[PDB]
């Protein structure tokens, strides 16, 4: 299955954090990376009172079940110092969010797929479009269409 994972970091050298995360993602059992987006420098959502993010996206081919992939992404976060979860955000070393998992629609205590807010976030959609320009969402909407019918502005490269 192809999982699309959003990567963000705005603490402790985001470029090192993202490169470390890429290496770790490739080492997840029963998985290998297919594609990696460019790296983008984005202002934080909300409280402007924190550093800029590095944002990226990757496509991961995996035979793991969705929650198994989640367990691994959460362990990579922890190994890279990310401890606060489901709280108001302050600067974080790493955030790995599962944007899409195949064409699956998941609404559990642990996992909401497609990511609940991705269609509102250029920092998720533009890196995804760079690696998957022909992508269609589970509800039949095309990614290209979402990005143009609502005039999302372009991002700056890191
Ligand atoms: N698609 C998904 N990817 C990652 N975590 C998800 C997820 N759907 C639900 N979750 C849940 O989200 C919980 C909180 O994760 P956090 O990383 O703290 C949210 P965040 O990434 O800071 O906000 P965001 O989801 O608005 O980007 C996790 O414990 C996980 O169970
Ligand atoms: N620019 C930017 N802001 C964010 N704000 C909150 C969150 C919550 O995870 N993520 C991000 C992000 O990835 N990029
Ligand atoms: Cl943290
Ligand atoms: Cl959808
Ligand atoms: Mg591997
Ligand atoms: Mg997030
Ligand atoms: Mg997260």
d(CA 56, CA 127): 6
Instruction: Identify which of 45, 56, 63 has the alpha carbon closest to the alpha carbon of residue 7.
Output: 56
* Alpha helix stretches (DSSP H) within the chain: 14-26, 66-79, 122-131, 143-149
| Method by which the model was determined | X-ray
Burial of 133 from C-beta contacts in 10 A (0-12 / 13-18 / 19+): exposed
Q: Show Cβ contacts of residue 130 under 8 Å, excluding neighbours closer than 6 positions.
A: 37, 38, 57
Q: Tell me how far apart the terminal alpha carbons of the chain are, to the nearest angstrom.
A: 29
Q: Measure 139 CA to ligand 4 centroid, in angstroms.
A: 4
Buried b (16+ CB within 10 A) or exposed e, 38-55: ebbebebeeeeebeebbb
Report which DSSP code applies to 86.
S
Q: Phi, psi at residue 156, to the nearest 5°?
A: -95, 135
Question: Do 101 and 108 form a contact (C-beta atoms < 8 A)?
Answer: no
Probe ligand 1: pick from 85, 96, 127, max atoms within 8 Å of CB?
Answer: 85
Instruction: Tell me how crowded residue 25 is: count the other CB atoms within 10 A of its CB.
Output: 23
**After which residue numbers is the chain interrupted with C–N beyond 2.5 angstroms?**
none
1-158 is classed CATH 3.30.70.2860: no
> Using CA positions, which residue lies closest to atom 6 of ligand 2?
45
145 and 138 Cβ atoms separated by less than 8 Å: no
**Could you tell me which of 117, 124, 92 has the C-alpha nearest to residue 4?**
124
C-alpha to C-alpha distances, 71 to 66, 92, 98, nearest whole angstrom: 9, 18, 11
Domain coordinates in residue numbering, the chain: 1-158
* Tokens at 12, concatenated: 């402790």
Resolution of the experimental structure, in angstroms: 1.2
d(C-alpha 96, C-alpha 81), whole Å: 13
Residue 88 annotated among the catalytic residues of the structure:
no
């Amino acid at each position: 299955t192809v999982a699309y994972i959003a990567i963000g970091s705005n603490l402790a050298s985001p470029l090192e954090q993202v490169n470390a995360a890429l290496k770790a993602l490739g080492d997840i059992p029963e998985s290998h990376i297919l594609t990696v987006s460019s790296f983008y420098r984005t202002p934080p959502l909300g409280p402007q009172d924190q550093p800029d993010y590095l944002n990226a996206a990757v496509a991961l081919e995996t035979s793991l079940a969705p929650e198994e992939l989640l367990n691994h992404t959460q362990r990579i976060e922890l190994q890279q110092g990310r401890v606060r979860k489901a709280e108001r955000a302050g600067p974080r070393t790493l955030d790995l969010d599962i944007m899409l998992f195949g064409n699956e629609v998941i609404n559990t205590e642990r996992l909401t797929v497609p990511h609940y807010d991705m269609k509102n976030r250029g920092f998720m959609l533009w890196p995804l479009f760079e690696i998957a320009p022909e992508l269609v969402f589970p509800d039949g909407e095309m990614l290209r269409q979402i990005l143009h019918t609502r005039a999302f502005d372009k991002l700056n490269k890191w």
